[PDB]
Amino acid sequence: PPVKESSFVEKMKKTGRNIIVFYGSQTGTAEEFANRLSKDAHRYGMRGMSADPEEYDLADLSSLPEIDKSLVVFCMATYNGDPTDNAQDFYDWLQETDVDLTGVKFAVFGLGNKTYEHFNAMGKYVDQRLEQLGAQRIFELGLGDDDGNLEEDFITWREQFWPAVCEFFGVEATSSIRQYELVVHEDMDVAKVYTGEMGRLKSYENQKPPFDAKNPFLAAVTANRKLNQGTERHLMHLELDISDSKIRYESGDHVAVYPANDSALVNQIGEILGADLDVIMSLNNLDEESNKKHPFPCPTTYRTALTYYLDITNPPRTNVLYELAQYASEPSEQEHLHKMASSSGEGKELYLSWVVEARRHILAILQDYPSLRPPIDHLCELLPRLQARYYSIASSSKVHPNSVHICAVAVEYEAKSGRVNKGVATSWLRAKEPAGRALVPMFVRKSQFRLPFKSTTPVIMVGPGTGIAPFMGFIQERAWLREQGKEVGETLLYYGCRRSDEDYLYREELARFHKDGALTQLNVAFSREQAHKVYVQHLLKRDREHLWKLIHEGGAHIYVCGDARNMAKDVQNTFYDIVAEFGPMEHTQAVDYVKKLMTKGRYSLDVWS
């Protein structure tokens, strides 16, 4: 619980702001959107500001009417049906408060993903709640879908939002504007230069607990081995030494890591722009009143910024390309970049195929539109921040209290852009070689994916491919409970891979556990050892009788991990069918029954894309 800032309304008054855009974000997208909306205000005679709801008391919303033509916008993302961490406070307040918001004008743009159970739950909630409290909606709720193209949904909403705002407040719709100023440092002492740390200067060198997202622990990579036999893919297992970090974790938790971009990619960006990446500088907010003094840790070199603080691989969003159009000396290229921000037409189609679908990163665009040569400092101000990557801890703290295990597949594919794209965190992790030791800045994030409290409760685990990760931890722990004399219920694993002798991850360890009885059943679907595809859900269907027994009589907990795209849903449907047959009951009731298991904490998910 952070110390709240002074009333955001009083701040708006002292700075002449009439619009405030709050962001509920975890990977920085909502914050990006909020900043874009805040900046838009300027182009409409108004003036806004972005703000972290966590640093304020939203009860002060009731004072917003004291500012003429005032307006609050909420750009909120949803995470596992809940508010983002930074907006949990706002959410709890919204539920317990009874404050009257008469006179308050708002608008909400929800960032979500249709593939989840509770799509845009937070945005939908905030939008409905503010109205119930007496506030009035100035523009319809925006429903962004990261499963299609969030950026386009945002563009569309934003394009209609502003005219609606202008029409209601009687405002007019009336250029390039830097948010930061560049200050090169020639006489800069080395001890004051950021070299990639996230919080306090030298926090990576001088490690002080407790460690978290703002102060990650640099864990030594003690192991890093290939898990599969083939060469088409690279699946790996790493062990991070967290001794003396005082960090605690449990099977089911996730470990986050801050990676470094590819040095060659960073080098080329500087080389193509003819910039000296080793120039030590700082980018200082031109708004001396904003709490955001820099876009990232400063002072630091461009090289360090592009390596540790900036995202240089993901397809640039439209506003970035829009702002860069001014630096392309070829009219046709400036025109293309300019139209990427269109809400329809060829400009939109080109953005979706040439940039998104092709997966062109910033360097790719700089190479494919050679007249585009922006100054390095402005590019750094425009790029999004490099985010940490999450991995499902593959070990049990009951067995490995001082080590965190990771099971992952290295990302590397041929993009239609014409080049081979490499996954940032996985290429970096793959390069980490045990024993100048190899360090991984990291931190643990607690999750609700947990083994049952009672050792006697049966467990049904389903995790094909890398989805096996959390379960290696579950299995280690359940075996441990047995070795300790505890009474353990059935422990079932439904795992899957292409072929027994090619990508059967942890084959040896799983055989051992099965032999010893830690694993009651080891059901493996080898999808390519026969003409037909054989998947985990096929084995669940096979064992439908017994699984129903465990679910209906034993109170078994279900766990699904891995591919959220198709595997998760296919597995869920098979459970719908098992319930419909043995209940018995109509599909409609089977679906309700399964979704009820989820709320009662007996059907947990740890899926990703």
Ligand X SMILES: Cc1cc2nc3c(=O)[nH]c(=O)nc-3n(C[C@H](O)[C@H](O)[C@H](O)COP(=O)(O)O)c2cc1C
Ligand Y SMILES: Nc1ncnc2c1ncn2[C@@H]1O[C@H](CO)[C@@H](O)[C@H]1OP(=O)(O)O
477 contact partners, CB below 8 Å, separation of at least 6? 251, 396, 398, 399, 451
Residue with tokens 């120039």: 279
Q: What is the pattern of x (binds ligand FAD, CB under 6 A) and - over residues 240-269?
A: --------------x---------------
* Binding segment toward ligand FAD, per CB under 6 A, in 121-129, 383-391, 454-462, 493-501: 383-391
Stretch of 110-118, 127-135, 455-463, 487-495 lying at the interface with ligand X (CB under 6 A): 110-118
Give every CB contact of residue 167 below 8 A, 6+ residues apart in sequence. none
Find which of ligand X, ligand Y, ligand FAD, none residue 496 binds, CB within 5 to 8 Å per kind.
ligand Y
463 binds ligand FAD (CB under 6 A): no
Helix (H) or strand (E) holding 552: helix 544-552
- Nearest to ligand Y of 449, 535 (CB atom): 535
- Give the range of 108-116, 131-139, 344-352, 463-471 binding ligand X by CB under 6 A: 108-116
392 is catalytic: yes
- In the stretch 18-57, what mask flags binding to ligand X with x, by CB under 6 A? -------xxxxxx---------------------------
Q: Which of 200, 188, 380 is nearest to 280 (CA)?
A: 188
Cα separation of 505 and 495, whole Å? Answer: 9
Sort residue 592 into left (φ over 0), alpha (ψ -120 to 50) or beta.
alpha
Q: Report d(CA 79, CA 112) in Å as an integer.
A: 8
Residue from 72, 165, 198, 408 binding ligand FAD (CB under 6 A): 408
DSSP letters for 498-525: S-TTTS-TTHHHHHHHHHTTSSSEEEEE
- Using CA atoms, how far apart are residues 434 and 432, in angstroms rounded to an integer? 7
* Cβ-contact 353, 347 below 8 angstroms: no
- In DSSP terms, which residues pair with 203 in a beta bridge? none
Per the structure block, which two tokens stand in for 377? 């400092």
Q: Which residues are documented as binding site for FMN?
A: 25-30, 77-79, 111-120, 146
- Annotated binding-site members for FAD: 359, 389-392, 407-409, 413, 423-426, 608
428 catalytically annotated: no
The answer to whether residue 228 forms part of the interface with ligand FAD (CB under 6 A) is no
Per the structure block, which two tokens stand in for 372?
Answer: 């585009």
The answer to whether 26 contacts ligand FAD (rule: CB under 6 A) is no
| Catalytic residue (one of 392, 396, 397, 604) | 392
527 binds, among ligand FAD, ligand X, ligand Y, none (CB under 5 to 8 A by kind): ligand Y
Chain residue at closest Cβ approach to ligand X: 112
Residue 380 bears catalytic tag: no
Among 304, 300, 275, residue whose Cα is nearest residue 184: 300
| Interface stretch with ligand FAD, choices 83-91, 140-148, 298-306, 403-411 (CB under 6 A) | 403-411
**Could you list the residues that contact ligand Y (CB under 6 A)?**
464-465, 496-498, 527-528, 533, 535-537, 566-567, 570
Q: Given the rule CB under 6 A, which residues bind ligand X?
A: 25-30, 77-81, 84, 111-113, 116, 118-121, 146, 150
Q: Which residues participate in catalysis according to the annotation?
A: 392, 561, 606, 608
